[PDB]
Subunit: 387 residues, 4 copies
């Protein structure tokens, strides 16, 4: 098997429903593992669901309080795409309360952070063997993407951060080849001010669209190759895509955060398309409910012509959403753009009267065809669930 | 692996019991996924069960009301043939409330419809990647076979419908090659008036025997190759095979619906054999109970000589049945004809006093040997089941 | 892969504990499928457990009354050797209330009987496809070995019976090659009078040691090759091995049933070793409790020198046993002799106060080393079990 | 595939968290198999968890009393590394109440002891076939490592013991090639006095660090090749690593047990590194709580310079630990040193108010990087568990 190449994105004009796991509905009888921060990544044979498990089954007493982000009992797990994660189908990849995974064409790489907040380490797993590690250098929650990394010609690129969420953190990119760290770079801060939870894809180069958790309702981004960071900015679109954010239309800021509705943000994604941009976002401008994707004409560039040419509403605003991220699927000579949406149920969502916090997953892929319309929310009646 | 070829059907003179999943009996302790619209399809290594799941486990609170046909929580799932579908053995193929699948000799293709009734889309999956789609053009429940499609020399043929169930719908056939739509045809309406839920097999050409849900107690059919629709009609047999239908013997109508007991019909199948025809049917002429298969001498043609030369009663009329469909299994130089029967339990069946609707499966294959006799119903005591 | 050859048995002087599933103990929480008539058979990569499931989970309401031998809800299932059969690990091989399976070196063959007592049929499955069938010719419980068949140079040999248990049945051997029946023979009745449930192995030729269910406390046997039945008799050993049977020592009858304690018998096995014989048997001479294996000096022949040179007590007489059968495992240039013991719990066993009937499995293999001693019974406390 | 070679250990300076199964937390709803004596061993494709199951699910009535070491209902089972062992994911390797496993580069070998205390036998399994056996020669609990054996150039080396725990036992090493016993040696007793439960790894030669259960708070060790035992001793380190043991610093004894706090000991491990040594140990000097690993400068040799240069506290002393053992993972031209820690919950641990005894697993691997810090205990709230 050859290493994955720097292919362009395939043509696309809309997104179509792919896999949906209905994990919460299916967990009513306590079979399903509690998770959050799911994502999808594919190898030569299959696409897979990944998520950070909580070391408990949904609805059991050990699931109470799983809103807590970091415990020693969290592992990155893998399970068949669109299935609910159960003890009979999951694989445990590594101990982790923050993770990223990607397939380089030959083998899987994983980046797994765990340990004390002030002294975490990232374990690099390659072909199932622990091959390298990163030591916390700022001693404040060493952490990574919570979605797939990207590999070009054998070199994998992954965003890694350490330092105070809310006090000037060090955002880095690491380059890793066959499980061995080659180099890192500190992300330039000339434009980007805050850069959490990058969602990345390949379109010749690696593009990452991330979360400014402090000052920007518009999303920061970077373009990277197998050698270096090439470009940075914020998405120009006057239609912002973080949560919270101002109502449409807002300000155009290509080089700085909007400086309004800046935090806390939510992990999200987008796809540059020529001078245009596709952006996922919650339907709500204030909370993690609903999900839509918009295409903004000339939204990647400084332009008077920003318009939402397409709006697909995929999860209604009467339903909970959560994180979202990009993944790619190799076509023949291009990469198809896809994404997942985390559908968070439980704490702290209003009226989800249970003690646990978990999610289900829904996914969509891009085609060069016109889409229809529908609604694919979590679908659980929370009143039916063990608390 | 070569693409599957236009092989003839193998010789056969009776049908024999193959796999049975006993899924409802085995679901008494809430392990089994709620399904309906099952079917079977085989690749080079295995035959598989497929079905439209309901995103709930049988007997849980989320299973209440699963008589409802179309929700966002339905997915096409696959599980080992003759096993009950459980979280530990299933795979999720795609989001779908209507589906068809077929193996072309190299890879699996799936056709998956989901979304709003007035704007559904069909996703085409090939080798696990979403490769194409069909947009609803009549805006009224875009839908497909609920059994296996057929592929000849790399081109797969699948029946797709859009438009009012009960007001003149557009019935089409699509030709799809390596996941890419090549062309479609509108089914000629010179003979066929209504054409739902086609059950297809290969005997050199593709033959489909379908469901007229409005005017015909006799079944409509078409013959198709890798290029075009070759022939259409209704099954000539004066012994009708839809449900409801007149008592035997009825009218011979080769070119039009019987115009009696026309609706609602049920998905079913048959096999042309020379000038004869094998037809599956419920034992009841009014409801979905029992299952038998008959061979009608000269039943494919206009003839004074129609007689039921063979009647195999496979599920007694004291037991519930449901949909049935054909599948083929490659022999060496011919295809063996097989079929499945959906055994529906729960709503709306009289005295199935539970709130859910699901099914089990039983299957039979044709051999050129004389069969014995037996009875292979669902077998659940509904009074034992969680409601 | 070449077809399996007519290899001799490897040298052996004792039997050693191999795999044990503890299926009843592990089924206390209703996870385990109800079974009986288990056996073991191996391919090039793995040994497997097989059994006739009852289409219900142990301890559920549908498990009540599973003492009943023949229902439409029984299937031959396969699961990893030494594991308990659960919905998450089993495969359904075919619908069956009597079965045999064997691997020919290239593919698995199965023989599966099901249907009405007076019109059953045997389906022959080869490489997963139904390839042939046998129609009941005596119309009285067409039935087979309940343990592995044997294949030599591509031709598989399997014992098949039809006709009154207790009124002169037709015992046959069938020869089947790549799933196609080649020929059958009626077993000669010059010596053998009753021949049920043969346990067979290969030692150059096929040897089968069976159950006379009417007149013989000594076991009937036959020797078969890829062409014909070569020899028949009853095991000469004055130490009998069916259940019930006379206390040791009893009569030597090489050519006829003992004519004492003849019925009902139990499926069992043995291994000829030169002029000696190894025989498995219950410890009790009256009921299905305990299990031991004995080696009888010159026990295969008419001789004044019969002595039990070895007695291994493997399941104590305070514990329930059941059926037992031989299987072989290819060494390099010989076959290793192994066997399984069915450990039946539930009805009708005295003080097993539950409504169901099921079993666990324990297995042993022969080595040319001296064995130790132990006890490997089912081990369930029946009072802990759901009834 | 070539046989595994005598590679050196890779460079390492700290240990990093790898896989963690959280098996007790995940067993709250009675899905998980009761185990103890877990270990890890890897083949060319995967690392695996192994353990001695108890033939019962955790929290069921059959789990009551599983503190008992030896029953016929114990089997060596295998399950994916870092997953909880459940009926849907486990494989049963052999009947065993003591075991060792190792992969030789081509196939798995297992050593499985079972049977009566006074007449046990060890079954040798190779490529899934039982190929040889060892008969108890001292008639007193024939037993083995409870962690992975080691194979060099096709010859596997395994420590096997028979005779009174507390009255002069025979400690042996066996050499086994493709499942056939080649030879054994009696371990020299010139230095070693007691040698139980060896934890072994490869660093050119095989090194084993074991448990003196009678006289030594320091650990006995041996160095072995494919032919013979090369060297024996006790670990020189004045910082002892068995449990119980004296507080640091204690005595330096390279050639004899410390003769203080000698019993009962606990299975543990270490890694020689030049003249230095890494030693795992409980945090407590009296009981099985906590886990740390220390590196002792010149700790392998007689030296005035013993100092703990590194102490990693991996499980706090407020949490239960248990057995620990080494395993290796092939890098390219060296073996990476790794280890597991058994986290025992239930009887007889103070305040674990349940009737059963089981464990979870956590694992760590060595890298030539500086580690961070954390805590990875079992994590179950025992008050939440079925008793
Ligand atoms: C990085 O990969 C390049 C090849 O990729 C091209 O250049 C990248 C920087 C990026 O722009 C991609 O989109 C381009 O496709 C490697 O360049 C090769 O280098 C080798 C060794 O010097 C040389 O023999 C080849 O000519 C180069 N190949 C091409 C097509 O230019 C480069 O080695 C990689 N760098 C690292 C640090 O891994
Ligand atoms: C979810 O858990 C809370 C907290 O549980 C308590 O603290 C935990 C860490 C653990 O120690 C538990 O055993 C404790 O009970 C539950 O709230 C508690 O409920 C109990 C019993 O009703 C009550 O006595 C305590 O005062 C409560 N503690 C607090 C701080 O509220 C809560 O009930 C659990 N939710 C569900 C649905 O079970
Ligand atoms: C459709 O397949 C044919 C081959 O199948 C034959 O013709 C079909 C229409 C149908 O009648 C089958 O049962 C027949 O077996 C393809 O015909 C080939 O075309 C290529 C390219 O022109 C030519 O080189 C070969 O001679 C043809 N092969 C044969 C045996 O005639 C045809 O290309 C297919 N059409 C499409 C649109 O895919
Ligand atoms: C199956 O469900 C019905 C309907 O449940 C109600 O509506 C659902 C959409 C959901 O909102 C439920 O929580 C509602 O209860 C059940 O019928 C209801 O039963 C409840 C309690 O007995 C009663 O208060 C309501 O009036 C009933 N509603 C109607 C319209 O009949 C029914 O009991 C369920 N069946 C089973 C076996 O549980
Ligand atoms: C049955 O197999 C034989 C080969 O097996 C040998 O003969 C058997 C009857 C039995 O005694 C075995 O243990 C022996 O090992 C086949 O004999 C071959 O026949 C072919 C074709 O005629 C011939 O070319 C070979 O010489 C034969 N091989 C040998 C070694 O004799 C025979 O064909 C098989 N019969 C059937 C009906 O399948
Ligand atoms: C095992 O089942 C028997 C029989 O159950 C009855 O007949 C079955 C075919 C089915 O129709 C059941 O629903 C019937 O109840 C049970 O014995 C019956 O128990 C019920 C309730 O106590 C009693 O009313 C009947 O008279 C009994 N029938 C007979 C013939 O004895 C038995 O209790 C079941 N065992 C267990 C452990 O549940
Ligand atoms: C044991 O293996 C040796 C090869 O391993 C080397 O010697 C060992 C004793 C040990 O020191 C290892 O670390 C060394 O790497 C085998 O030696 C071979 O023997 C064959 C046959 O005599 C001979 O042709 C080769 O020259 C030897 N190879 C080398 C490199 O010396 C030896 O056969 C093994 N012994 C047994 C009993 O299996
Ligand atoms: C764990 O089991 C003990 C012992 O159970 C008894 O002995 C077993 C071998 C088996 O025969 C059981 O059926 C017996 O009950 C339990 O202690 C017993 O509890 C019962 C009921 O409360 C009491 O009548 C006995 O006197 C107790 N026996 C002893 C020796 O203490 C214990 O309760 C079980 N623990 C749990 C959590 O269920
Ligand atoms: C610690 C910073 C980080 C990004 C802002 O916080 C996160 C936000 C979360 C959220 O906004 O939902 C949940 C995450 N599990 C989390 N990451 C970790 C490692 O705890
Ligand atoms: C919508 C038309 C169609 C065929 C007549 O109706 C069906 C009949 C059904 C039935 O007669 O049982 C159940 C089906 N799930 C259904 N199809 C969909 C897509 O809802
Ligand atoms: C029908 C004759 C046959 C052999 C004597 O009876 C059997 C004896 C049985 C027994 O003695 O336990 C159980 C079997 N399941 C059975 N076989 C069938 C097909 O019902
Ligand atoms: C019998 C001697 C042996 C080593 C000291 O005892 C063990 C100690 C144990 C322990 O100290 O936890 C548990 C073990 N399961 C055991 N081994 C067997 C075979 O019973
Ligand atoms: Ca923000
Ligand atoms: Ca009709
Ligand atoms: Ca008898
Ligand atoms: Ca359960
Ligand atoms: Ca000690």
């Amino acid at each position: 098997r050859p290493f994955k190449s720097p292919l362009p994105l395939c043509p696309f004009r809309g997104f179509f429903p792919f896999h949906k796991d209905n994990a919460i509905r299916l967990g009513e009888n306590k079979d399903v593992i509690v998770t959050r921060e799911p994502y999808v990544s594919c190898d030569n044979d299959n696409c897979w669901s990944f998520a950070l498990a909580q070391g408990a089954l949904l609805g059991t007493k050990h699931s109470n309080g799983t809103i807590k982000d970091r415990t020693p009992y969290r592992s990155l797990i893998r399970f068949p795409i669109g299935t609910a994660p159960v003890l009979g189908n999951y694989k445990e990849i590594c101990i982790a309360w923050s993770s990223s995974s990607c397939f380089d064409g030959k083998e899987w790489m994983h980046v797994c952070m765990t340990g004390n907040d002030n002294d975490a380490s990232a374990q690099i797993i390659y072909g199932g063997r622990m091959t390298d590690s990163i030591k916390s250098w700022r001693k404040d929650i060493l952490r990574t993407q919570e979605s797939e990394c990207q590999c070009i010609d054998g070199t994998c690129v992954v965003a890694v951060t350490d330092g105070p969420a809310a006090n000037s953190a060090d955002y880095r990119v690491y380059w890793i080849r066959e499980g061995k760290i080659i180099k890192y770079e500190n992300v330039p801060k000339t434009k980007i001010q805050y850069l959490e939870e990058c969602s990345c894809y390949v379109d010749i180069d690696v593009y990452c669209i991330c979360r400014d958790n402090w000052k920007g309702s518009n999303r920061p981004w970077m373009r990277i190759n197998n050698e270096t960071i090439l470009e940075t900015g914020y998405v120009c679109s006057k239609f912002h895509s973080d949560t919270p954010r101002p109502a449409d239309p807002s300000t155009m800021s290509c080089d700085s955060p909007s400086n309004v509705n800046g935090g806390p943000g939510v992990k999200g994604f987008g796809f540059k398309a020529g001078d245009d941009v596709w952006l996922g976002r919650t339907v709500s401008t204030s909370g993690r409910s609903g999900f839509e994707i918009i295409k903004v004409t000339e939204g990647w560039i400084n332009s008077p012509n920003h318009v939402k040419s397409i709006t697909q509403t995929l999860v209604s605003n009467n339903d909970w959403s959560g994180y979202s991220g990009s993944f790619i699927v190799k076509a023949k000579d291009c990469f198809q753009p896809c994404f997942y949406v985390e559908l968070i149920r439980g704490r702290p969502n209003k009226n989800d009267d249970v003690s646990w916090t978990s999610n289900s997953i829904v996914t969509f892929c891009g085609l060069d065809n016109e889409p229809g319309s529908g609604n694919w929310p979590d679908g659980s009646n929370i009143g039916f669930m063990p608390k």
